[PDB]
Every structure is written in structure tokens, then in C-alpha cells.
Amino acid sequence: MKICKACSSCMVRTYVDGNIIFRCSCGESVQGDSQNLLVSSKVYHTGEMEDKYKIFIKNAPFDPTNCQIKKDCPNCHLDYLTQICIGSQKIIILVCRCGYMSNRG
Amino acid sequence: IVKQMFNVDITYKDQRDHTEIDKLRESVQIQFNFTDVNIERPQHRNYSQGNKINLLPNKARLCGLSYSGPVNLAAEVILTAHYSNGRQEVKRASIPPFQ
Amino acid sequence: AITIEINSTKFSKLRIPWYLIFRMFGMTGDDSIIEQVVFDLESNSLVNTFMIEILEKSIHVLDPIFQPVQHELNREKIIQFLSEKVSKFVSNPSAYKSDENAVQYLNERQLTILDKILLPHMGQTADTRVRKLRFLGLLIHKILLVIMN
Amino acid sequence: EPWTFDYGKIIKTAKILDISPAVIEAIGAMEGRSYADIREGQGAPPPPTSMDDPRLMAVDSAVRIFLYNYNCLRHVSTFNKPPIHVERLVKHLSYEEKEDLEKVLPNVVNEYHTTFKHLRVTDPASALLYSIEFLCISFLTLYEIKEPSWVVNIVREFALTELNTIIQSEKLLSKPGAFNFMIFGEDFVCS
Ligand SMILES: [Zn+2]
Ligand SMILES: [Zn+2]
């Protein structure tokens, strides 16, 4: 995302000819070096189990409706933990109100 | 609904030109609002000239009547006359609560 | 494109580009609009990247109907264009323009309409227009989050 | 470098634009008032108290318009075909002279966009004053251009044309006076 320093407008990319030169509707150009060459990308089985459920995992020990199991918490030694199942991979996560997160999630 | 939501500000632009002021004027702003409304219990005219005696539900069901309560409204009407050269003549009237 | 259509008394089946509605209320800078939608242009993330790129794509899409005011950064011109398009009883598109007071009447009526029609639960006063823009950006953010599955 | 509202710039703009200084200050606040009230300074709304005040966005749109079209005048040679407002200006100059506008014309945006965002959050009251001051500061920075001789006439006309376009459009959001409603070709007119 390139924004015009004067117009604060989105600039087209305009790959001409051997380089990348951004152009605004105001006629300004800023060009681009090295790190602007990424045209498009796609990563498979990524963006899942980190960004989709971060808030849900954080709030899970405080959710009354989450299922809980009898398992000792390593940190605060509470006799019960909150059991969490996410994804078509069925990843089981145990979280506690003390912040213990089972290093998974 | 009647008071807050039913406000009218409509302007008409005539073509009537039968008087000098009529030619000078091609506009009129009709503006009015209601501040009174109340539904009272159903009434029936016993002999078409009575004092609207009470209408009981079985009378409505038997006689095919509608068990409906009358709606009493009162409105404030503001009429503004718009002329050329910026003149503006306003006529205001207050209507008694009518049904 | 991401088109926003408002259906109420004064509006019907009229589809507006989102950035146009945003910059109708000032804030004509694209940076501000993208910040209103994605809530932050400075935290990279994987979600903000996708939303930012697709909002760019929506911004640069040429719609056939709102072409004259698509690239316009002038708030008054866009307000006039929408008032002309959406308000009835105005058959002459050129006769009224030569009168300044007719222009002012149309602009004021359109601004009052948009105050009363765009997210009325957010407020029905002109001082609540920026928080309406915040709420609309939040709605667009929620839709684009749902797109990500 | 610290910043403080320089009210002197606003008055200087008012004289050059032959409009009252209250008309300069009331940018973004013309709604709900007649134009006669704007110049009289009557019913001026209190300074903004929150970052969500639409006046802050309204004034910033005015500053953006000045910068947006100035860059069009800065980069007339870069356009495939220059816009109409600047076509009137540089119609009489050559292509080589058009390419000279980019270097000669100073860069006036400075750091308005970065400064405005911090002020809009930290001090909403001063965000309005800074934006208006910046709009006037750039105007006299344009208007007080002295050389080269050809660029004096081009810039001077543009600067006067721009703010008057900004003010007129800003004036067009004020209350409308008496006019013939028949100009819209139908039987009725609503509000
Ligand atoms: Zn630009
Ligand atoms: Zn624990």
C-alpha cells in the first residue's frame, strides 16, 4: 500500500519498464526499490490457528461455557484446565486463567 | 408516530396569474404538524343522531361492526407564501382537536 | 468494488462506492478511510494486508454511474452529485446550477437527509458524522473478516 | 520544532481574498448558518472538543484540495492531459516550460499530514486551528512567490482561484437564501 505524500491517495503500481514506479492521481511519482517487487503471494495452510482464534483463546479461561478437564496446570497448579478444540485438524489446547497456554496456539 | 415522525414541509409552485401579486408569486410552502392524538374507547350512533353511546364487543361481533376507537387529532398549520425579490408572507392557523 | 447501498424513504436501489460515502463527510484522504476500515495501517499482520489490498482494489475500480465524482476530492461536488441523483422533483440538471441559492438548498437538504438516513442509531446530528464513519468502517471490517473465512 | 497558532496569517489571507477573517476561520462550520452570518462572525460554533468532530475532517478536506490541485499544477507535464482548472492556467506555456514547473515550484505540503494526525488525536481544538493556519500559510507561500517572472503570474492566479473555489464550495454548504424554487422542473419541492 502506497499513499501519496501530498494527496494522501492510493497510487497505482504501473510496472514500467524495468522498475516499479507508483503514480498518484495528482501526477506525483515516488518509484520503488527492492521491497516493492512483491506483486502477489499465496501461502497454503497459513493464517489459521494464529490470527483467527487469538482473542477466543485469550478469553477462553474466562468463558463459563467452555469445556473443562481435570488436569494440573503447570504454572498455578489449579486442578482444572480449560480444554479447547480448534480447526479441521482438531488441535486440543489447554489454557488457564493464569495465562498458561500449553505452548500450542 | 403522529407527532415526531409526521412532519410536512411541502412547497408548491403555482401558475395562477390573475392578480399582480399572483404574477409576482410562483411558490407556496405548505408546512404543518400535529401535537395532539388520542384513541378513545369505541362509540356507536344508536339512532344515527345520538350522542355516540358505548359500543360493546358483542354488539360489534353480532352486527358486523368494527370494534374501533375514534382518533382525535389537532394540527398546527403554517402556510408561507414565497414571492420574487425575497418576500415571504406567512399565514398561521391552529386547528381545534378534530376527529 | 465495495458498494454501499442505502434503502430508506429518500433513497432506493442506489449503489454508492464506499469511499465516496466516506469522503462525503470530509476525511477525503484515502489514508484516513483505510485506517477507519482496518483500524491500523502500521501493524502489518496477515489480516490487515488482505483488507488493505482489497480496499485498494475497490478504491481503484471504475464504476459506470459515479464516474464524474469518483476521483473528485471536493466534498461539495460529491454532495451535489448525490443530491441531484437521489432527490426527486429536480428534472433540469443544468438550469438549477446557474443559481447559487438553488445549489445551496440542494446541498443543505442532502446533508440533512444523509444526517437522518445514514446509520440513524449512531446519531441524527451533524456532529455524529465522524463516529458514523468509524462505525461504517467497522462494518466493512467485519464483512472483510468474514470473507477470509 | 514546537508550534503555536499564528493568527497573523489568517488576517493577511482575509485581505488578499477581500473576505472577512471570520469567513476564513469558519471553514468546515458553515452548516446551519446563512452566509451573512458567516462573515459577521455570528453564531460561531465553539472550538472542537473531540477527535470525532466533523469540523476537523471538513477543514482537512479543504487543505487536501489545495494540495491535490497544486500538485496538478506542479506536475502538468506528467499528465496525459491536464485537468480543466489547470488547463486554463498553463495553456500559454510550452512543453519544456511545463516540465520546468516541477523543479521551480517549491514543495509546500511539508509535514501537514503527519502533523495533523497527531494534533487531531492529542488536541482536537488546536487541530482545527493548525489546518486553517496551514491552508493560509501555504496560500501566502504561493502568493509571495517572486521569481522566476513567468511563474509569478501563473502561481498568483492559481492561489487566488483555489481558495476562492474552496471558500465558495464551503460557502455553498451554508443556509440558502430566497430564490425561485421553479428552477427544478416539477410541481413540488420538499425538504
Ligand atoms: Zn497525490
Ligand atoms: Zn494456571
Q: Which of D15, D40, D52, D27 is nearest to D129 (CA)?
A: D27
Work out the angle at residue D159's Cα, subtended by the Cα atoms of residues D125 and D59, and round it to the nearest 5 degrees: 20
**B67, B77 contact by CB (below 8 A):** no
User: Least CA distance to C42: which residue of chain A?
Assistant: A1
Distance from CA of D178 to the nearest CA of B (A): 5
Residue of A1, A12, A47 with shortest CB distance to C46: A47
- Tell me if C129 and D54 make a contact (CB, 8 A cut-off): yes
- Residue the block writes with cell 360489534: B60
DSSP chain D: ------THHHHHHHHHTTS-HHHHHTTT--TTSBHHHHHHTTTPPPPP-STT-HHHHHHHHHHHHHHHHHHHHHTTTTSSS--HHHHTTGGGS-HHHHHHHHHHSPP--TTHHHHHHHHHHH-HHHHHHHHHHHHHHHHHHHHT---SHHHHHHHHHHHHHHHHHHHHHHHTTSB-----GGGSSSSEEE-
- Which CA distances in Å does C48 have to C4, C30, C53? 21, 15, 8
This PDB structure is determined at a resolution in Å of: 2.8
User: Least CA distance to B25: which residue of chain D?
Assistant: D180
Q: Residue B32 phi/psi, 5° resolution?
A: -155, 165
Name the closest ligand to CA D113.
Answer: 1
CA A11 to ligand 1 centroid distance, Å = 8
**D43, D22 contact by CB (below 8 A):** no
User: Least CA distance to A7: which residue of chain D?
Assistant: D68
**B3, B37 contact by CB (below 8 A):** yes
C-alpha cell, D120: 487531531
Q: Residue B9 phi/psi, 5° resolution?
A: -135, 90
Q: Residue B84 phi/psi, 5° resolution?
A: -70, 180
> Which residue of D57, D65, D67, D70 is the best one to mutate when testing the A interface, meaning the one whose CB has the most A CBs within 10 A?
D67
- Residue the block writes with cell 438516513: C117
**Burial status of residue B50 (CB atoms within 10 A of its CB: 0-12, 13-18, 19 or more):** exposed
Judged by DSSP in three states, B74 sits in strand
**D87, D112 contact by CB (below 8 A):** no
With b meaning 16 or more CB within 10 Å and e meaning fewer, what string describes A50-79? Answer: eebbeeebeebbeeeeeeeeeeebeeeeee
CB count, 10 Å around CB of D108? 18
Judged by DSSP in three states, C3 sits in strand
